[PDB]
Amino acid sequence: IAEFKEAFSLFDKDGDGTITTKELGTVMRSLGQNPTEAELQDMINEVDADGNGTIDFPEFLTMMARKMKDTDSEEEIREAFRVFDKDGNGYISAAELRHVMTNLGEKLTDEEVDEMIREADIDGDGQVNYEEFVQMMT
């Protein structure tokens, strides 16, 4: 929380308790991004729960708690995908899947693992990439 309040303190350049689009802009610029006023206003609006035009700590903390929880769940889905992607090439092959499933207690045939890939293989390249992996978890 204090880590999140500490982050808040860097955005609030003048310490009045709120983050304006200009203050957000100043930070983003120090991060190697130079968004247009248009973009900056979208970013504020996305977080500005009471609509008053600026972001306060409770608004900031609330978005960060979701972003943390979203980030935690992606890190963990990413962990699972690597486990399946044995050679690490970013695609899960029929053979890696079959092999990892046997490790998961499920001795499957080439036909069964082939159907499992096809059900997941949106782009049709005979394998499962990370995007397709997340969809069939979903």
Regarding 25 and contact with Ca ion (CB under 5 A), the answer is no
Regarding 52 and contact with Ca ion (CB under 5 A), the answer is yes
Nearer to Ca ion, 26 or 39 (CB): 26
Per-residue DSSP letter, 56: E
Regarding 119 and contact with Ca ion (CB under 5 A), the answer is no
Q: Which of 85, 97, 113, 133 binds Ca ion (CB under 5 A)?
A: 85
Regarding 106 and contact with Ca ion (CB under 5 A), the answer is no
Furthest C-alpha separation in the chain: 64
**Contact assessment for residue 97 and residue 48, using Cβ atoms and an 8 Å cutoff:** no
Task: Give the CA dihedral 92, 93, 94, 96, nearest 10 degrees.
Answer: -70
Pick the closest to residue 55 from 67, 37, 43, 71 (CA basis). 43
Nearer to Ca ion, 35 or 72 (CB): 35
Residues in contact with Ca ion by CB under 5 A are 12, 14, 16, 18, 48, 50, 52, 85, 87, 89, 91, 121, 123, 125
